[PDB]
């Protein structure tokens, strides 16, 4: 079971190893385009935090999930920021969500006072008054219910079937990583021109000891040229100091 459009869940993925092979191995995965990265390079980088959003929308509105899109579901239900990093996966799920007798447990906004900024939180289902007169109590004239239920039946043609959607969002290499890729470590070498790969950083140089004190929330050092020159070893937490050959 996936949540409604208007109650998309946000799951925690951290302190584990993520293998995207099984993710990309599913046959019916069709609308799979990634913005900040390339889909075949997800297995070699470490992400600081990963989030997954699940909701089921109609087929005619799957195109509204792209960043910057305008419409009626991307203004009152779920909006993506213009600087989105990550990507979305969509696939048809007419097999399960639709029912012979009619499944009516999926809802979505129809009216709202104003649009919503990216991800800003809300659920309230109070009545909405069209007229200038204040309306309360129950439904009637110029004050309605802001919810409508999807009708998912096999008789509907293409463009009305339920479409399960999942969205993955993540930052990139600015914090102590927790979600990584499947890779094998090795033994650190001191004072020798090597080709290090420290949690995503590829470079060349010799690694020494450093005395500079890193606060618990810092992992990288920088200089005026704004290039990394001091990194903290994941496994054992002493501070190194990168200098070229």
């Amino acid at each position, epitope marked *: 079971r996936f949540a409604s459009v208007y109650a998309w869940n946000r799951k925690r993925i951290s302190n584990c190893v993520a293998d995207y092979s099984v993710l990309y191995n599913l046959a019916p995965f069709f609308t799979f385009k990634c913005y900040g990265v390339s889909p075949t390079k997800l297995n070699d980088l470490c992400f600081t935090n990963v989030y997954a959003d699940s909701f089921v929308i109609r087929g005619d509105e799957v195109r509204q999930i792209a960043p910057g899109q305008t419409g009626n579901i991307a203004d009152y239900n779920y909006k993506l920021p213009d600087d989105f990093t990550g990507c979305v996966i969509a696939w048809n799920s007419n097999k399960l969500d639709s029912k012979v007798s009619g499944n009516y447990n999926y809802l979505y906004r129809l*009216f709202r006072k104003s649009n919503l900024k990216p991800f800003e939180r809300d659920i309230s289902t109070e009545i909405y008054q069209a007229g200038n007169k204040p309306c309360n109590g129950v439904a009637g004239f110029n004050c309605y219910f802001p919810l409508r239920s999807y009708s998912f039946r096999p008789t509907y043609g293409v463009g009305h079937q339920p479409y399960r959607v999942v969205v993955l969002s993540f930052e990139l290499l600015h914090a102590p990583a927790t979600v990584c890729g499947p890779k094998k470590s090795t033994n650190l070498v001191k004072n020798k021109c090597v080709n290090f790969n420290f949690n995503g950083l590829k470079g060349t140089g010799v690694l020494t000891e450093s005395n500079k004190k890193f606060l618990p929330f810092q992992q990288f050092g920088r200089d005026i040229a704004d290039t990394t020159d001091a990194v903290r070893d994941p496994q054992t937490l002493e501070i190194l100091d990168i200098t070229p050959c």
Partner: antibody
Framework: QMQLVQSGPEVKKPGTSVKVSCKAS?????????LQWVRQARGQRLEWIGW????????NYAPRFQERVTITTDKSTSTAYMELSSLRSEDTAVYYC????????????????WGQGTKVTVS | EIVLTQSPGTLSLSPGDRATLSCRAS???????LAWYQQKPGQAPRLLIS???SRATGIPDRFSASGSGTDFTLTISRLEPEDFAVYYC?????????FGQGTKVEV
């Protein structure tokens, strides 16, 4: 301009059914706008039949019209249909469709716009 | 379940005079869901005032609404000879809507 249009008067026979439409180019059905239907006989008091919501699709019928009338709204074609069955001589009257000028969230408590009405007569 | 009675039944006053009409019901009290209409022979009814507090488009200041209780009232300052018609009171709040019987004014 902002005015509704409707079909012409019609003559039918007993044991038949009709469909009455209020598709008007002078008004935009949008999503908050709603319209009611009224009937005027020869020198009789006006009677309310029903009104429906374009957005949520909810209806509201008279306590005595749950057996021979159906009201539906199509936003794509911007029209409202009534299927009327069992048309006797008491149903021969002029129909009118009314809807306020309600665009987006701004509209008043009165049905300013008014259709000219169609005279349905059955012999 | 609401029945509206409009009074007085008939009128015959000189043009340009001041007149006032009322309508009555038996259900709960509401003032903002009431509308007044005029219907002419061969023409669709037209709206005059809605909610007893606001005017419609193109409605001159002649029609003035009043009344705070269950009663509803309308007042016309001058009877210009084209206003001879029938008035209708309509409510919205309660169970399915129903109009009044109508008040006809004569010359």
């Amino acid at each position: 301009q902002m005015q509704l249009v409707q079909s012409g008067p019609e003559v039918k026979k007993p044991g038949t059914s009709v469909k009455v439409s209020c598709k008007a180019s002078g008004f935009t059905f949008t999503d908050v706008s709603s319209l009611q239907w009224v009937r005027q006989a020869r020198g009789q008091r006006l009677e309310w039949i029903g009104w429906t919501v374009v957005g949520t699709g909810n209806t509201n019928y008279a306590p005595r019209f749950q057996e021979r009338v159906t009201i539906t709204t199509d936003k794509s074609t911007s029209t409202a249909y009534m299927e009327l069955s069992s048309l006797r001589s008491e149903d021969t009257a002029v129909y009118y469709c009314a809807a306020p000028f309600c665009s987006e969230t701004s509209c008043s408590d009165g049905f300013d716009l008014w259709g000219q009405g169609t005279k349905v007569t059955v012999s | 379940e609401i029945v509206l009675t409009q009074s007085p039944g008939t009128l015959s006053l000189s043009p340009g005079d001041r007149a006032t009409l009322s309508c009555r019901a038996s259900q709960s009290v509401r003032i903002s869901y009431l509308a007044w209409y005029q219907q002419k022979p061969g023409q669709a009814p037209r709206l005059l005032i809605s909610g007893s507090s606001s005017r419609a488009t193109g409605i001159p200041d002649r029609f003035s609404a009043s009344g705070s209780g269950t009663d509803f009232t309308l007042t016309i300052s001058r009877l210009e000879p084209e206003d001879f018609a029938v008035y209708y009171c309509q409510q919205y709040a309660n169970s399915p809507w129903t109009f009044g019987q109508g008040t006809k004014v004569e010359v």
